[PDB]
């Protein structure tokens, strides 16, 4: 499954399933730790969409699962998220891509 | 089909805004004149141990064409400046006075356009030539007919010198090359032409014969003036290249351009034989080969002019 | 086997030739017509001579005898043989011919033919002597071979002669514009001599033995085989001819540079040899590229391993796939 | 192909092209791109298009280039009334040596005195019927 | 470890500069993927960090400053600068109203008519469901404000001549900078506030409303503001172009009126003779171009209006006033004062440098010559396609783009799917010009010659020679281009399209391309005839069947080249004629095995033969060949005015064809039978356009003069043709009837008499 452990605990009754577009500080963090993606790091907060599943079916599911106004460590199993190949690049092979999004608005 | 041809006050907008552009920019700028050649040469050459501007151009010019690269590229910039110097030199009754003035400006502006080292470039870049006729070809000619016009004897002489150091078989190989393809009048080609002139011009809304007849005048041209002056020393080097390893005799390929040249124009006079009236394109082409032959009797008479 | 060929051959230092005196007293005196001489090739140093079995050919200069190597021109007369030279045997009274990229074998015959007559043309003595010192260069790296090949089988040579000539030969290749002119056409001359194989041949030999011979002689074998590599480097700058060999033998410079010992200029041949032909890198393959990756995780953090990367990245003025996709998926998603 | 065509007739041509086939490709049948040219106000004749059919998954420069090459003797016949048209503006619809010498300098061509002379000849003055002949030439 | 830190270290710094370039590489021509796992390593922060840090290590801040181009704005820029060529001016209500003088204006201010591909970013993202590639996006307004106080900044340090240089020299504090600055500008990142305070920056005295040119500089930082000075007389040159275009909008309206109503009063008034032929002279009989340049012929007796005249000759005066030719505030002088004095100072060993540098003084005072130069690459776009031009720009740059890219796989899918959007592009066959200007046909001939060089991609070439055909079929200047690289098609050229249909498709449908055909081009096609022989087909090669000595597919490809390069508009060109027919007699091999040994009816009755014995076999294709080589030979006959006139070397001509083909053979030939009916496949057997052909030799060499020659003929296949297409009355009877409307009916109602 997907692993949560909440890191900045916050409002618990919103929840993101209900299909429209979210905002998310969503990052990314390698096997071994290195953050590969962050949202930090580009400056500037990804827009996440409920239900389109333009984003990874493993990501996707983490995202969902934590509620809206809260933040946890969105650990997700490298099967689920980008399988055993990944990033071309950005993820080495089979290497855990574990996720630490917070959810912001929407 | 003139009479439902598709007037000018009704037609597409854009495509009449384009013609009228075209058709101004040909009226206009090509016989706009802009005498800035000389004001740019000598603004630049005001040089206000170190090299002046102009030299410094000198000198990369002869560095690049210095490499071996067996190519010739666009150099748009050597195109602009070749004609801007070869023009600048080419500023060229009268009384004594006034005819000694002008010979002592044309030697003075020769002089500035000379020390710097624009025999050597000439030199090289015609070396680097190959034989390959284009562009390159005639824009040095050019810059070599300004840098050498009045018979300039200090111009031979550094070219005499760079020639016995250098000591390159290559420069008389790639003139050979160069002078032996030159265009002579073909038949084939003059009646080419005649029946491109009967389907008519105006027909789906200069000549192939003759075409390089300038290249060819302006290049005997400067071959008749890098033999002017007398000078005995560069006849003897053009006639045998002792201190080079291969000697090219310059007069044989010469003499055998004037036989094919000759034999042009006889068969150009059999075919125009039976007819008594000579067309116009007939007596252009005839005007043509006459001044090509003329300067080549000139270069001849250079060649052969002193004891 | 004596054979006239055109082309590049009259340009190489195969096309040399040495004409010595009978007398050995005043051999520099003026050839005259009819005078015995005899012709040594610079390149091969084997005196030809007219053999009965062979006709026209080199000989050894041990079996050269005086008789079969006596030659001399038939027309202080002639300018460096320029006139109509026959090539006739003192001994025999043959005339030299032709029999059959155009090359033709040249042989003996009793009667010839009407244009046997051939021009001679004078060589530098720069360029003599530089077929000299190759030649004798290139013989002493054949007596190296062959000691190497009678050590080889048996466990338990001239290295400092062997050091000295290549000492000697980096000198001569060493990098200084006509100097980089000359430069290039004498490794060109030392390549169609093969003098880059022979290089080859030691390199592979050193790298056949991992250590023989006795404990101090082989001490130096470590820098022999530095000195060869470094000769080799310096014929592979400036050399058309040595860049198109390498790309033809990437595997094997490839293998020989995964060797821990003496990576530095296996490398460094590898890195000038793909600057000098681009078309190695699109020759290359994904081994290459993991070495390259690998060498870095095993040696250490170097440049010139970087270097060599950046110069397989793009080559040619554009960017080839294969290279890009090996080196964006060999050592960038490890990050280490 | 079409480089004497009409831009607007190109431009409909193309729209009707696009809307036909939506893929680009130029895999409307033959049949039914001149279903669509007769719905678009052009019918076609059926021999004509029996005939395109039979000489010839083709994009639509090549159907453009068909369509001129249909459309050739269309574009000849309204040359040949444009020249009559001509011919008729002349007195009585008859061009004389004059008449035929102005038309020849106001086209541009430039024609000389023996090729007016032919002319004439061919078509002193002309009649309506030689000045139709020459038109048609 | 910090950055900064690893400056003295000499080993880390060189290590992460190493690193920096196998980046700047890796991304380096196109690769948005890779140029995506760079900033995704490097993530996007770190190289705005390492911008706005001044202590960072020089070489080290030297390498990020690259790459922050190189892997996010290198393929927006290339595009940009490829696109600046074409300065397609589409007309528009803001950019009708044009002025080049607002004094000089400002280099790179104002509305720009140009139609510019705009470029397009997209957000980088790593967490999307991964299963080409956009450019990853840029901070654009955030990056160019980051950049212009780094160049005020740069600028401030210059002035105070401070002895502690950014990044440790004066290289490393400002070459970057330049080098960013001008990349982003070249993007048209930075509006007209942006840009003027850049060049206020730069020279505040001379763009009145010290600089960086006047504080010295090195060699490279010269560079650099030589860049930018190119570019600001590029620019320039843009809004000249730009009121030269509104213009001609303008004129061209007032023209159309004063046409109209010239027409008009021409129309009512009929009294007049000469004057009436004198405006028929100027108007629609005359070509369209013909016009233009009478209506234009009052430079320096017109029927065009006075006060018109005088607009346009003003209009003219503005123009050489704003180039300057003939009279540092103005920017010409400015950079030709900067020029001279950077030459002036010292000797600078960078060849590069100093030839920009005098690239743009010419440039500069020339203002006209470049306008001249640039006169051709102009062109007005209609107003309701210009989203058409747009795409048309935008493919053309993605076709650059890839030509720049070595070729390989998985990357001619895009070219071929870029080269079917040109051709269903409206603007690509409406107007032929933006085709011409954009240099499609160049970008494609330089794709077909990198993969050309065994033909490793033969879509790429099918589509590319597809393409160049279909160029030469838009107009006949087109033709003419193709004319002029003619040599290459005929020197390099199996299946589908080749380059020697392109150009035969160049050729055909124009008389003065086919007269003009050079003695080269027949030698070539003469000794590949030549060559035809003793060889085999590849199709029939690949099918396993034994050789016949010659292969039909070439050889019938090439014939049929020269019966185009003969027969054009009808007529046949009597020198093309004589030279081709004498370079195909010269070598007897080109010619069928059985002409020399056997006959046309022995070679017709061995096609049959082989038809009978078990879309590729090669009864047809040699019954093919066949027949395009009698009918190649009686193409190039004289016609009869030739015949008429008595010609020594048409009459040799026609009687060496006749003796070479006797008639016999040829009604030998016609008379064979076709199976009229279920209906047979004409791909596997004899087509009626060999008797069609045959037929078309036969009047052209012979001809039926006596009328029992005309009896025997009408009897002999002429009959038994007539008896089955009235019995067959398909696609077979629908090619009979063809065959007899092409060659039977002309040649009866020719032989009527």
Same mark, same amino acid.
Not at chain 2, 283 to 294: D, P, T, Y
Not at chain 5, 505 to 525: G, R, Y
Not at chain 5, 651 to 673: E, F, H, M, N, T
């Given at each position: 499954?997907?692993?949560?452990?909440?890191?900045?605990?916050?409002?618990?009754?919103?929840?993101?399933?209900?299909?429209?577009?979210?905002?998310?500080?969503?990052?990314?963090?390698?096997?071994?730790?290195?953050?590969?993606?962050?949202?930090?790091?580009?400056?500037?907060?990804?827009?996440?969409?409920?239900?389109?599943?333009?984003?990874?079916?493993?990501?996707?599911?983490?995202?969902?699962?934590?509620?809206?106004?809260?933040?946890?460590?969105?650990?997700?199993?490298?099967?689920?998220?980008?399988?055993?190949?990944?990033?071309?690049?950005?993820?080495?092979?089979?290497?855990?891509?574990?996720?630490?999004?917070?959810?912001?608005?929407? | 089909?003139?009479?439902?041809?598709?007037?000018?006050?009704?037609?597409?907008?854009?495509?009449?805004?384009?013609?009228?552009?075209?058709?101004?920019?040909?009226?206009?700028?090509?016989?706009?004149?802009?005498?800035?050649?000389?004001?740019?040469?000598?603004?630049?050459?005001?040089?206000?141990?170190?090299?002046?501007?102009?030299?410094?151009?000198?000198?990369?010019?002869?560095?690049?064409?210095?490499?071996?690269?067996? =190519?010739?590229?666009?150099?748009?910039?050597?195109?602009?400046?070749?004609?801007?110097?070869?023009?600048?030199?080419?500023?060229?009754?009268?009384?004594?006075?006034?005819?000694?003035?002008?010979?002592?400006?044309?030697?003075?502006?020769?002089?500035?356009?000379?020390?710097?080292?624009?025999?050597?470039?000439?030199?090289?870049?015609?070396?680097?030539?190959?034989?390959?006729?284009?562009?390159?070809?005639?824009?040095?000619?050019?810059?070599?007919?300004?840098?050498?016009?009045?018979?300039?004897?200090?111009?031979?002489? =550094?070219?005499?010198?760079?020639?016995?150091?250098?000591?390159?078989?290559?420069?008389?190989?790639?003139?050979?090359?160069?002078?032996?393809?030159?265009?002579?009048?073909?038949?084939?080609?003059?009646?080419?032409? @005649?029946?491109?002139?009967?389907?008519?011009?105006?027909?789906?809304?200069?000549?192939?014969?003759?075409?390089?007849?300038?290249?060819?005048?302006?290049?005997?041209?400067?071959?008749?003036?890098?033999?002017?002056?007398?000078?005995?020393?560069?006849?003897?080097?053009?006639?045998?290249?002792?201190? @080079?390893?291969?000697?090219?005799?310059?007069?044989?390929?010469?003499?055998?351009?004037?036989?094919?040249?000759?034999?042009?124009?006889?068969?150009?006079?059999?075919?125009?034989?039976?007819?008594?009236?000579?067309?116009?394109?007939?007596?252009?082409?005839?005007?043509?080969?006459?001044?090509?032959?003329?300067?080549?009797? @000139?270069?001849?008479?250079?060649?052969?002019?002193?004891? | 086997?004596?054979?006239?060929?055109?082309?590049?051959?009259?340009?190489?230092?195969?096309?040399?030739?040495?004409?010595?005196?009978?007398?050995?007293?005043?051999?520099?005196?003026?050839?005259?017509?009819?005078?015995?001489?005899?012709?040594?090739?610079?390149?091969?140093?084997?005196?030809?001579?007219?053999?009965?079995?062979?006709?026209?050919?080199?000989?050894?200069?041990?079996?050269?005898?005086?008789?079969?190597?006596?030659?001399?021109?038939?027309?202080?007369?002639?300018?460096?043989?320029?006139?109509?030279?026959?090539?006739?045997?003192?001994?025999?009274?043959?005339?030299?011919?032709?029999?059959?990229?155009?090359?033709?074998?040249?042989?003996?015959?009793?009667?010839?033919?009407?244009?046997?007559?051939?021009?001679?043309?004078?060589?530098?003595?720069?360029?003599?002597?530089?077929?000299?010192?190759?030649?004798?260069?290139?013989?002493?790296?054949?007596?190296?071979?062959?000691?190497?090949?009678?050590?080889?089988?048996?466990?338990?040579?001239?290295?400092?002669?062997?050091?000295?000539?290549?000492?000697?030969?980096?000198?001569?290749?060493?990098?200084?514009?006509?100097?980089?002119?000359?430069?290039?056409?004498?490794?060109?001359?030392?390549?169609?001599?093969?003098?880059?194989?022979?290089?080859?041949?030691?390199?592979?030999?050193?790298?056949?033995?991992?250590?023989?011979?006795?404990?101090?002689?082989?001490?130096?074998?470590?820098?022999?085989?530095?000195?060869?590599?470094?000769?080799?480097?310096?014929?592979?700058?400036?050399?058309?001819?040595?860049?198109?060999?390498?790309?033809?033998?990437?595997?094997?410079?490839?293998?020989?540079?995964?060797?821990?010992?003496?990576?530095?200029?296996?490398?460094?041949?590898?890195?000038?040899?793909?600057?000098?032909?681009?078309?190695?890198?699109?020759?290359?393959?994904?081994?290459?590229?993991?070495?390259?990756?690998?060498?870095?995780?095993?040696?250490?953090?170097?440049?010139?391993?970087?270097?060599?990367?950046?110069?397989?990245?793009?080559?040619?003025?554009?960017?080839?796939?294969?290279?890009?996709?090996?080196?964006?998926?060999?050592?960038?998603?490890?990050?280490? | 192909?079409?480089?004497?065509?009409?831009?607007?007739?190109?431009?409909?041509?193309?729209?009707?092209?696009?809307?036909?086939?939506?893929?680009?490709?130029?895999?409307?049948?033959?049949?039914?791109?001149?279903?669509?040219?007769?719905?678009?106000?052009?019918?076609?004749?059926?021999?004509?298009?029996?005939?395109?059919?039979?000489?010839?998954?083709?994009?639509?420069?090549?159907?453009?280039?068909?369509?001129?090459?249909?459309?050739?003797?269309?574009?000849?016949?309204?040359?040949?009334?444009?020249?009559?048209?001509?011919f008729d503006k002349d007195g009585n619809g008859y061009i004389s040596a004059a008449a035929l010498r102005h038309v020849m300098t106001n086209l541009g061509e430039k024609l000389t005195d023996e090729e007016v002379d032919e002319m004439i000849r061919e078509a002193g003055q002309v009649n309506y019927e030689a000045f139709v002949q020459m038109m048609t030439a | 470890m910090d950055?900064?830190?690893?400056?003295?270290?000499?080993?880390?710094?060189?290590?992460?500069?190493?690193?920096?370039?196998?980046?700047?590489?890796?991304?380096?021509?196109?690769?948005?993927?890779?140029?995506?796992?760079?900033?995704?390593?490097?993530?996007?922060?770190?190289?705005?960090?390492?911008?706005?840090?001044?202590?960072?290590?020089?070489?080290?801040?030297?390498?990020?400053?690259?790459?922050?181009?190189?892997?996010?704005?290198?393929?927006?820029?290339?595009?940009?600068?490829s696109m600046l060529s074409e300065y397609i001016v589409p007309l528009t209500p803001e950019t009708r109203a044009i002025t080049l003088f607002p004094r000089h204006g400002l280099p790179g201010v104002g509305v720009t008519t140009s139609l510019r591909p705009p470029h397009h970013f997209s957000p980088p993202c790593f967490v999307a469901a991964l299963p080409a590639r956009l450019?990853?996006?840029?901070?654009?307004?955030?990056?160019?404000?980051?950049?212009?106080?780094?160049?005020?900044?740069?600028?401030?340090?210059?002035?105070?001549?401070?002895?502690?240089?950014?990044?440790?020299?004066?290289?490393?504090?400002?070459?970057?900078?330049?080098?960013?600055?001008?990349?982003?500008?070249?993007?048209?990142?930075?509006?007209?506030?942006?840009?003027?305070?850049?060049?206020?920056?730069?020279?505040?005295?001379?763009?009145?409303?010290?600089?960086?040119?006047?504080?010295?500089?090195?060699?490279?930082?010269?560079?650099?503001?030589?860049?930018?000075?190119?570019?600001?007389?590029?620019?320039?040159?843009?809004?000249?172009?730009?009121?030269?275009?509104?213009?001609?909008?303008?004129?061209?309206?007032?023209?159309?009126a004063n046409q109209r109503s010239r027409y008009a009063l021409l129309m009512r008034a009929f009294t007049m003779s000469a004057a009436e032929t004198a405006r028929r002279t100027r108007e629609f009989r005359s070509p369209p171009q013909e016009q233009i340049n009478m209506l234009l012929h009052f430079k320096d007796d017109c029927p065009l209006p006075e006060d018109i005249r005088?607009?346009?000759?003003?209009?003219?005066?503005?123009?050489?006033?704003?180039?300057?030719?003939?009279?540092?505030?103005?920017?010409?002088?400015?950079?030709?004062?900067?020029?001279?004095?950077?030459?002036?100072?010292?000797?600078?060993?960078?060849?590069?440098?100093?030839?920009?540098?005098?690239?743009?003084?010419?440039?500069?005072?020339?203002?006209?010559?470049?306008?001249?130069?640039?006169?051709?690459?102009?062109?007005?776009?209609?107003?309701?396609?210009?989203?058409?031009?747009?795409?048309?720009?935008?493919?053309?740059?993605?076709?650059?783009?890839?030509?720049?890219?070595?070729?390989?796989?998985?990357?001619?899918?895009?070219?071929?799917?870029?080269?079917?959007?040109?051709?269903?592009?409206?603007?690509?066959?409406?107007?032929?010009?933006?085709?011409?200007?954009?240099?499609?046909?160049?970008?494609?001939?330089?794709?077909?010659?990198?993969?050309?060089?065994?033909?490793?991609?033969?879509?790429?070439?099918?589509?590319?020679?597809?393409?160049?055909?279909?160029?030469?079929?838009?107009?006949?200047?087109?033709?003419?281009?193709?004319?002029?690289?003619?040599?290459?098609?005929?020197?390099?050229?199996?299946?589908?399209?080749?380059?020697?249909?392109?150009?035969?498709?160049?050729?055909?449908?124009?008389?003065?391309?086919?007269?003009?055909?050079?003695?080269?081009?027949?030698?070539?096609?003469?000794?590949?005839?030549?060559?035809?022989?003793?060889?085999?087909?590849?199709?029939?090669?690949?099918?396993?069947?034994?050789?016949?000595?010659?292969?039909?597919?070439?050889?019938?490809?090439?014939?049929?080249?020269?019966?185009?390069?003969?027969?054009?508009?009808?007529?046949?060109?009597?020198?093309?004629?004589?030279?081709?027919?004498?370079?195909?007699?010269?070598?007897?091999?080109?010619?069928?095995?059985?002409?020399?040994?056997?006959?046309?009816?022995?070679?017709?009755?061995?096609?049959?033969?082989?038809?009978?014995?078990?879309?590729?076999?090669?009864?047809?294709?040699?019954?093919?060949?066949?027949?395009?080589?009698?009918?190649?030979?009686?193409?190039?006959?004289?016609?009869?005015?030739?015949?008429?006139?008595?010609?020594?070397?048409?009459?040799?001509?026609?009687?060496?064809?006749?003796?070479?083909?006797?008639?016999?053979?040829?009604?030998?030939?016609?008379?064979?039978?076709?199976?009229?009916?279920?209906?047979?496949?004409?791909?596997?057997?004899?087509?009626?356009?060999?008797?069609?052909?045959?037929?078309?030799?036969?009047?052209?060499?012979?001809?039926?003069?006596?009328?029992?020659?005309?009896?025997?003929?009408?009897?002999?296949?002429?009959?038994?043709?007539?008896?089955?297409?009235?019995?067959?009355?398909?696609?077979?009877?629908?090619?009979?009837?063809?065959?007899?409307?092409?060659?039977?009916?002309?040649?009866?109602?020719?032989?009527?008499?």
């Amino acid at each position: 499954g997907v692993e949560i452990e909440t890191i900045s605990p916050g409002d618990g009754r919103t929840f993101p399933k209900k299909g429209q577009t979210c905002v998310v500080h969503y990052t990314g963090m390698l096997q071994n730790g290195k953050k590969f993606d962050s949202s930090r790091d580009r400056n500037k907060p990804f827009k996440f969409r409920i239900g389109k599943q333009e984003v990874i079916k493993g990501f996707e599911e983490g995202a969902a699962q934590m509620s809206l106004g809260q933040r946890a460590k969105l650990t997700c199993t490298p099967d689920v998220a980008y399988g055993a190949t990944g990033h071309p690049g950005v993820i080495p092979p089979n290497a855990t891509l574990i996720f630490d999004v917070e959810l912001l608005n929407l | 089909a003139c009479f439902r041809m598709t007037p000018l006050y009704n037609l597409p907008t854009h495509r009449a805004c384009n013609m009228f552009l075209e058709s101004y920019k040909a009226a206009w700028i090509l016989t706009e004149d802009h005498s800035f050649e000389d004001r740019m040469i000598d603004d630049l050459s005001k040089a206000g141990k170190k090299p002046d501007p102009l030299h410094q151009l000198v000198l990369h010019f002869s560095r690049t064409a210095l490499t071996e690269k067996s =190519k010739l590229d666009e150099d748009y910039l050597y195109m602009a400046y070749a004609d801007i110097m070869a023009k600048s030199c080419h500023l060229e009754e009268v009384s004594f006075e006034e005819k000694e003035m002008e010979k002592q400006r044309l030697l003075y502006q020769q002089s500035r356009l000379h020390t710097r080292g624009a025999a050597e470039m000439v030199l090289q870049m015609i070396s680097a030539c190959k034989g390959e006729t284009g562009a390159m070809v005639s824009s040095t000619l050019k810059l070599g007919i300004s840098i050498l016009n009045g018979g300039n004897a200090e111009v031979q002489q =550094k070219m005499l010198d760079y020639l016995k150091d250098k000591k390159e078989v290559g420069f008389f190989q790639s003139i050979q090359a160069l002078m032996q393809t030159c265009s002579v009048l073909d038949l084939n080609a003059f009646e080419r032409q @005649n029946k491109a002139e009967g389907l008519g011009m105006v027909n789906e809304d200069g000549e192939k014969v003759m075409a390089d007849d300038e290249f060819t005048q302006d290049l005997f041209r400067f071959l008749q003036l890098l033999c002017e002056g007398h000078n005995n020393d560069f006849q003897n080097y053009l006639r045998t290249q002792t201190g @080079n390893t291969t000697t090219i005799n310059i007069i044989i390929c010469t003499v055998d351009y004037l036989l094919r040249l000759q034999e042009s124009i006889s068969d150009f006079y059999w075919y125009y034989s039976g007819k008594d009236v000579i067309e116009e394109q007939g007596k252009r082409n005839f005007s043509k080969a006459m001044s090509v032959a003329k300067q080549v009797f @000139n270069s001849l008479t250079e060649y052969i002019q002193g004891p | 086997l004596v054979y006239y060929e055109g082309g590049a051959v009259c340009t190489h230092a195969r096309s040399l030739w040495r004409l010595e005196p009978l007398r050995i007293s005043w051999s520099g005196s003026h050839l005259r017509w009819g005078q015995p001489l005899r012709i040594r090739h610079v390149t091969t140093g084997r005196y030809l001579a007219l053999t009965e079995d062979q006709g026209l050919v080199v000989v050894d200069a041990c079996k050269a005898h005086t008789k079969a190597t006596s030659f001399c021109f038939r027309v202080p007369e002639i300018k460096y043989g320029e006139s109509l030279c026959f090539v006739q045997h003192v001994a025999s009274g043959l005339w030299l011919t032709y029999a059959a990229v155009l090359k033709k074998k040249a042989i003996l015959h009793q009667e010839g033919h009407m244009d046997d007559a051939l021009f001679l043309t004078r060589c530098q003595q720069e360029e003599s002597q530089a077929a000299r010192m190759i030649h004798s260069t290139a013989g002493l790296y054949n007596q190296f071979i062959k000691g190497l090949d009678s050590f080889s089988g048996k466990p338990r040579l001239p290295i400092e002669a062997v050091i000295l000539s290549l000492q000697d030969l980096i000198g001569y290749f060493e990098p200084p514009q006509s100097k980089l002119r000359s430069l290039r056409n004498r490794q060109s001359l030392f390549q169609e001599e093969g003098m880059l194989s022979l290089v080859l041949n030691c390199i592979d030999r050193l790298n056949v033995y991992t250590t023989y011979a006795g404990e101090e002689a082989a001490e130096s074998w470590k820098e022999i085989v530095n000195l060869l590599y470094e000769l080799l480097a310096s014929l592979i700058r400036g050399n058309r001819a040595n860049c198109a060999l390498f790309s033809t033998n990437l595997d094997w410079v490839v293998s020989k540079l995964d060797r821990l010992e003496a990576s530095s200029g296996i490398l460094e041949v590898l890195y000038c040899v793909l600057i000098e032909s681009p078309e190695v890198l699109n020759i290359i393959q994904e081994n290459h590229i993991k070495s390259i990756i690998s060498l870095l995780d095993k040696h250490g953090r170097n440049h010139k391993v970087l270097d060599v990367l950046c110069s397989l990245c793009v080559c040619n003025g554009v960017a080839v796939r294969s290279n890009q996709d090996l080196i964006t998926e060999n050592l960038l998603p490890g990050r280490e | 192909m079409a480089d004497q065509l009409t831009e607007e007739q190109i431009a409909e041509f193309k729209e009707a092209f696009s809307l036909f086939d939506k893929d680009g490709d130029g895999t409307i049948t033959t049949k039914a791109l001149g279903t669509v040219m007769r719905s678009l106000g052009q019918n076609p004749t059926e021999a004509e298009l029996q005939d395109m059919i039979n000489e010839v998954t083709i994009d639509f420069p090549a159907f453009l280039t068909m369509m001129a090459r249909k459309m050739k003797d269309t574009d000849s016949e309204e040359e040949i009334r444009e020249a009559f048209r001509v011919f008729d503006k002349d007195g009585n619809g008859y061009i004389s040596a004059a008449a035929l010498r102005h038309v020849m300098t106001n086209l541009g061509e430039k024609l000389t005195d023996e090729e007016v002379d032919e002319m004439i000849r061919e078509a002193g003055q002309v009649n309506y019927e030689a000045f139709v002949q020459m038109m048609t030439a | 470890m910090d950055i900064l830190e690893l400056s003295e270290r000499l080993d880390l710094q060189r290590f992460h500069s190493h690193t920096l370039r196998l980046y700047r590489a890796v991304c380096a021509l196109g690769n948005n993927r890779v140029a995506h796992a760079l900033c995704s390593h490097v993530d996007q922060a770190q190289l705005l960090h390492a911008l706005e840090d001044a202590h960072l290590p020089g070489p080290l801040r030297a390498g990020y400053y690259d790459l922050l181009i190189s892997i996010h704005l290198e393929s927006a820029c290339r595009s940009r600068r490829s696109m600046l060529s074409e300065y397609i001016v589409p007309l528009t209500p803001e950019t009708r109203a044009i002025t080049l003088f607002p004094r000089h204006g400002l280099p790179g201010v104002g509305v720009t008519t140009s139609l510019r591909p705009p470029h397009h970013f997209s957000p980088p993202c790593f967490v999307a469901a991964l299963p080409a590639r956009l450019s990853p996006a840029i901070p654009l307004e955030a990056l160019r404000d980051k950049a212009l106080r780094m160049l005020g900044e740069a600028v401030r340090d210059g002035g105070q001549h401070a002895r502690d240089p950014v990044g440790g020299s004066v290289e490393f504090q400002f070459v970057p900078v330049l080098k960013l600055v001008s990349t982003l500008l070249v993007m048209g990142i930075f509006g007209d506030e942006d840009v003027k305070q850049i060049l206020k920056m730069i020279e505040p005295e001379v763009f009145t409303e010290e600089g960086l040119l006047q504080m010295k500089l090195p060699e490279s930082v010269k560079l650099q503001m030589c860049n930018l000075l190119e570019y600001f007389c590029d620019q320039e040159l843009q809004h000249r172009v730009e009121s030269l275009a509104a213009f001609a909008e303008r004129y061209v309206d007032k023209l159309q009126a004063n046409q109209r109503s010239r027409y008009a009063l021409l129309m009512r008034a009929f009294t007049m003779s000469a004057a009436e032929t004198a405006r028929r002279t100027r108007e629609f009989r005359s070509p369209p171009q013909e016009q233009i340049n009478m209506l234009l012929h009052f430079k320096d007796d017109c029927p065009l209006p006075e006060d018109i005249r005088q607009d346009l000759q003003d209009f003219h005066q503005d123009l050489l006033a704003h180039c300057g030719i003939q009279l540092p505030q103005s920017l010409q002088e400015l950079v030709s004062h900067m020029v001279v004095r950077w030459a002036q100072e010292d000797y600078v060993q960078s060849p590069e440098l100093v030839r920009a540098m005098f690239s743009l003084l010419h440039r500069q005072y020339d203002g006209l010559g470049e306008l001249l130069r640039a006169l051709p690459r102009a062109y007005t776009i209609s107003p309701s396609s210009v989203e058409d031009t747009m795409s048309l720009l935008e493919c053309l740059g993605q076709i650059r783009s890839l030509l720049i890219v070595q070729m390989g796989p998985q990357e001619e899918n895009l070219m071929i799917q870029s080269i079917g959007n040109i051709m269903n592009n409206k603007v690509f066959y409406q107007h032929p010009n933006l085709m011409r200007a954009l240099g499609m046909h160049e970008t494609v001939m330089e794709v077909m010659v990198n993969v050309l060089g065994e033909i490793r991609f033969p879509k790429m070439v099918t589509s590319c020679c597809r393409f160049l055909c279909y160029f030469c079929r838009i107009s006949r200047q087109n033709q003419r281009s193709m004319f002029d690289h003619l040599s290459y098609l005929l020197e390099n050229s199996m299946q589908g399209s080749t380059p020697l249909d392109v150009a035969a498709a160049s050729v055909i449908d124009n008389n003065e391309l086919a007269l003009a055909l050079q003695e080269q081009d027949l030698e070539k096609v003469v000794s590949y005839l030549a060559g035809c022989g003793l060889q085999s087909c590849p199709m029939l090669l690949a099918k396993g069947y034994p050789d016949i000595g010659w292969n039909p597919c070439g050889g019938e490809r090439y014939l049929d080249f020269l019966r185009f390069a003969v027969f054009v508009n009808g007529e046949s060109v009597e020198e093309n004629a004589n030279v081709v027919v004498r370079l195909l007699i010269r070598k007897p091999e080109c010619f069928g095995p059985a002409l020399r040994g056997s006959g046309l009816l022995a070679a017709i009755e061995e096609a049959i033969r082989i038809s009978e014995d078990p879309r590729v076999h090669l009864g047809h294709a040699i019954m093919s060949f066949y027949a395009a080589l009698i009918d190649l030979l009686g193409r190039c006959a004289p016609e009869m005015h030739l015949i008429q006139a008595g010609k020594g070397e048409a009459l040799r001509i026609r009687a060496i064809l006749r003796s070479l083909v006797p008639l016999d053979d040829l009604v030998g030939i016609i008379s064979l039978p076709l199976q009229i009916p279920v209906q047979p496949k004409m791909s596997a057997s004899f087509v009626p356009d060999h008797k069609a052909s045959m037929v078309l030799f036969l009047d052209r060499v012979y001809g039926i003069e006596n009328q029992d020659f005309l009896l025997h003929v009408l009897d002999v296949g002429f009959l038994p043709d007539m008896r089955a297409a009235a019995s067959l009355d398909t696609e077979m009877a629908l090619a009979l009837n063809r065959y007899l409307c092409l060659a039977v009916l002309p040649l009866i109602t020719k032989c009527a008499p």
